Design an enzyme around this catalytic site. Structure first.
Site, mmCIF file in Angstrom:
data_model
loop_
_atom_site.group_PDB
_atom_site.id
_atom_site.type_symbol
_atom_site.label_atom_id
_atom_site.label_comp_id
_atom_site.label_asym_id
_atom_site.label_seq_id
_atom_site.Cartn_x
_atom_site.Cartn_y
_atom_site.Cartn_z
ATOM 1 N N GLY A 33 0.766 -1.240 0.000
ATOM 2 C CA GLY A 33 0.000 0.000 0.000
ATOM 3 C C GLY A 33 0.795 1.288 0.000
ATOM 4 N N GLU A 34 1.906 1.303 0.751
ATOM 5 C CA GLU A 34 2.777 2.460 0.977
ATOM 6 C C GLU A 34 3.417 3.017 -0.297
ATOM 7 O OE1 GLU A 34 5.668 2.449 4.214
ATOM 8 O OE2 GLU A 34 4.243 1.574 5.643
ATOM 9 N N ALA A 35 3.258 4.319 -0.512
ATOM 10 C CA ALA A 35 3.846 5.073 -1.607
ATOM 11 C C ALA A 35 5.365 4.884 -1.678
ATOM 12 C CB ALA A 35 3.519 6.553 -1.464
ATOM 13 N N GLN A 36 6.080 4.995 -0.547
ATOM 14 C CA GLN A 36 7.550 4.835 -0.542
ATOM 15 C C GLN A 36 8.034 3.439 -0.953
ATOM 16 O OE1 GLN A 36 8.634 6.229 3.398
ATOM 17 N NE2 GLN A 36 7.344 4.711 4.398
#
Length: 186
Positions: A94-97
């Protein structure tokens, strides 16, 4: 064999725990290459657990991530085709990074397999995100303002070493996404 089925079940619930189990019981060699192969083959493995493991910021999981991307073969594939194969092999976290790190490894490997398509790996990286965003814009019902192929071309101007990519390439990629939303695994 039932020890390996136990490890697979353990990995599917907790990737770190499953790998710890498979290593401790001498069922998997503890190298980034062997771990990347086990993930790439993914036999009886859950793609969310694969993605969660590959997305960890620990320096070793990152080594596994790069070794996993090296196992992918993108030669003579256009960017969308290569993205489909890559995005099918694991579920994006899920995390953008984490997505950015995984996409950086993808872009480097895409260019390694298809040199001459993109002037730099950064153009490939930027276009890959524009493709992912396009997939959401076209196929997500909450997006009412659907970009036309002309808007997608215009939005990507200047990304190729200050210049524009050939429209034949851009139209082909847009058409592929329009005709088939990315298959997202669980």
């Amino acid at each position: 064999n039932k020890q390996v089925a136990m490890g697979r079940k353990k990995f599917n619930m907790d990737p770190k725990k499953g790998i710890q189990f498979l290593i401790e019981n001498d069922l998997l060699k503890n190298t980034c290459e062997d771990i990347a192969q086990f993930l790439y083959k993914g036999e009886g493995l859950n793609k969310t657990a694969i993605g969660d493991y590959l997305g960890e910021r620990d320096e070793f999981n990152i080594q596994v991530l790069h070794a996993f991307v090296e196992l992918h073969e993108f030669t003579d594939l256009n960017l969308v085709q290569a993205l489909r194969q890559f995005l099918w092999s694991f579920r994006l976290p899920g995390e953008a990074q984490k997505i950015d790190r995984m996409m950086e490894a993808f872009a480097q490997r895409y260019c390694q397999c298809n040199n001459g398509v993109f002037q730099s790996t950064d153009t490939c990286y930027v276009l890959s995100f524009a493709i992912i965003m396009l997939n959401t814009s076209l196929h997500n019902p909450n997006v009412k303002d659907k970009p036309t192929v002309e808007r997608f071309i215009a939005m990507n101007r200047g990304i190729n070493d200050g210049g524009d990519l050939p429209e034949e390439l851009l139209r082909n990629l847009y058409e592929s996404i329009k005709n088939e939303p990315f298959k997202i695994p669980e």
